[model samples]
Target: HLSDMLQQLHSVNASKPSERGLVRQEEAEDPACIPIFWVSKWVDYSDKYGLGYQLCDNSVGVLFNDSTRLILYNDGDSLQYIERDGTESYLTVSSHPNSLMKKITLLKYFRNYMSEHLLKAGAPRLPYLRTWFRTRSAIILHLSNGSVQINFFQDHTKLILCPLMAAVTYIDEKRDFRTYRLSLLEEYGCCKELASRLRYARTMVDKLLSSR
Candidate 1:
């Protein structure tokens, strides 16, 4: 097991915000053991183009077939869209253009799809798909709050790290779920499976952390 190897620095440090110093205080303040925001559930429609998912905060979003993204706020009245071509669009339940009908149709569908299943992440700051990319292994989403959500393909798994929350959440292939405090490494340490994945996150984190 390369478990102990994680702290040795081959890769995979982004998931540990507390370890990396994202914790704002060192006194008695407790790091959020709970995750900040994550795709509590998702519907994959790649047969056409993209995916639809709902955050733990009741925010539903669709990364459309053409690679654009539109996320509706919790109440389902307001929304924000960032075009794949780099344009910005924001709309209300009553104000969007007719050209947006097709996307709106699925956005509503995703919302309904999850509602029937029942799920929630938290009182998050409204996750937005700020940065994204495509590859065969996984589709990566750099959401609001610096929460990096990685959707793995072949492994049939997902990983999300919320630095502010100081936690890592994982959904394994069998569909089991776990939310881990990054600070736990101080005692038990990271396993090789997660460590390997985190190595990828190390580079990916540097990808977004590069913005500043």
Candidate 2:
């Protein structure tokens, strides 16, 4: 079931925040953990450098790189990371009525499609789309019979989805972007319901973001 898969994913060590240098005090302990604070949309040199003062409000995440890249973000009440060498991303949702409607409408669409696909494939079930506020929570999706896994969440006013792939070790190395493509699922011959749900969810989230 989708909820079961989500639960299993959350239980994995990789799902929890692995990197711990995001707090202001933690960064002070190491010269390497630089701060990136953004003043306005068009701000300072630090913005271009990808390091600046921390913007708590209206900001989703921060990325730090040394031996490997560390992605830190505010999740509800606590800070979290993308786990070193892990790939993840998200969608944003708001509290407004129209925003709520869009979310409901999209989930309704997924319900039918995911239900139809899961029945024949013996895949995990998907539950009603859940929501939370100013709190920290994460669930990883074990897709393609646990061969592929990704993390996802809704922190603050956004829905975040992490893509699946092997870790990137080198600072300059790039992840296999193809692994994230829906077509890749065809190659693996796995149930494609999860991929389709994610694609639609991301599209709806993007629409919400652009509307705002």
Candidate 3:
């Protein structure tokens, strides 16, 4: 069965420093600090922090430490693995209700009764209102006026511990939110983080993309 698992998967070659792959940094002068990194899973994207790294070294002497694996998602999101006596605590966010709700309620109230629901034909026009109802991605806030979605890929759940709803948002912003497409968010700066996250030396992105 173990052999079969190995046979089922294939090796992948990482193209960029951002994408995940086996990196061999050979120092011609200093052999002691030759940085060799193997990325596992992407975590999150934050303007505060670029991309986080995770360790997944398969080298004979190197042990696979989850902390060193500074993996990043395509949205320039990253994960900071925390070890609490063996248990792990992931960085996440929760619904910003109340004020957000009042805002959306006002929007809905204005749109429906005030404007006779003029813009309620296609996908929900009031994006934040819908985001408030379902589990939204980790949103970065600046006094509530501007909040860019962290847009990190959760393992099997949201940062708030909610089940992933495929395309988290369908607004079609600068980044693509396709759940099953490899080319989603391919042009953003965080895409480098995505490139880093998908690189598994002996594994394929398709396998990682499969349900966790």
Candidate 4:
């Protein structure tokens, strides 16, 4: 694991804060572990910078230098990583709705999908999604085999393979001025969705850019 390679450069969590022994200090410092389903929009693809990385939020944030990874920034200062699996000592928390919706809620869908497929029967313990203030929840469906996944929620749901208009807009806005051809849609779940959103976001950006 790369985590084994990276040194403990800096960590904010020092001691656990607790009123009862049941809750350890570290547990208090770390935010509650919430599972999310990403339902990646496309497959991984190679770009000028080796493999294009996925940025959490960008009209073009879909594609980034491999050097960068998706991070949940707090107050535009603190950065939190998206947990790969449910196991983690501590987790970064945020009140931002977008943060919870995109990360936590989405992850739950992924876990449920895995459990349903991996296990012979459903888990005996009924799992649920819970965030800070808002009650987190989602519905999962096996769209097509285990290859692709989609997350359905009460307000806004995410599609798996669908194109994204925003991603295309991101490529245009970048100084490179290189466009991501639609053919790249097969890259990854994120990249594919990003491409779809970009198509729509690009139209808006272009209209706004032209107006200016």
Best by the lDDT measure? 1
By lDDT, is 1 or 2 better? 1
What tens-digit string does per-residue lDDT give for candidate 1 at 75-129?
8789887887868788976788998888888788878988897544332336666
lDDT of 2 at 155: 24
| Model 2 spans > 4 angstroms off | 1-183
Ranking by TM-score: 1, 2, 3, 4
lDDT of 1 at 206: 60
Tens digits of per-residue lDDT, candidate 2, 1-212, equal 33332332333223222223222212212222111221111111222222211222322222222211112233422222233455433332332235234333333333334334322210000111111111133222112122212223332111122222211001001211111222222223222333333443433333333442
**Which window of ten consecutive residues has the lowest lDDT sum in model 2?**
121-130
Please list the residue runs of candidate 3 whose C-alpha ends up more than 4 Å from where it truly belongs after superposition. Answer: 1-18, 22-108, 113-177, 180-190, 193-212
User: Which of candidates 3 and 4 reaches a greater lDDT?
Assistant: 4
The sequence of per-residue lDDT tens digits that candidate 4 reaches over residues 1-212 is: 11210111001111111111342212221112111222222222324321211112210111113322233221332333323343322243344345444543333343334334432110100011111011233222221111112222342433222122111111111212122222222221123333333333223323323443
lDDT of each candidate versus the true structure: 0.65, 0.25, 0.22, 0.24
Alpha-carbon shift of residue 161 in model 3 (angstroms)? 9.4
**Candidate 1 local lDDT, residue 96:** 89
Backbone collision count in every prediction? 3, 18, 21, 35
Clashing residue pairs, candidate 1?
Answer: 12-198, 12-199, 56-121
Which ranges of candidate 1 are over 4 A from the true structure? 1-30, 117-125, 130-140, 151-158, 163-167, 170-188, 191-197, 203-212
Q: What is candidate 3's lDDT per residue for 74-185, written digit by digit as tens? A: 2222222223243433331123334333322322232223223222111110001001111242222110111112223343211111012111121123332222112122
Model 4 clash tally, residue pairs: 35
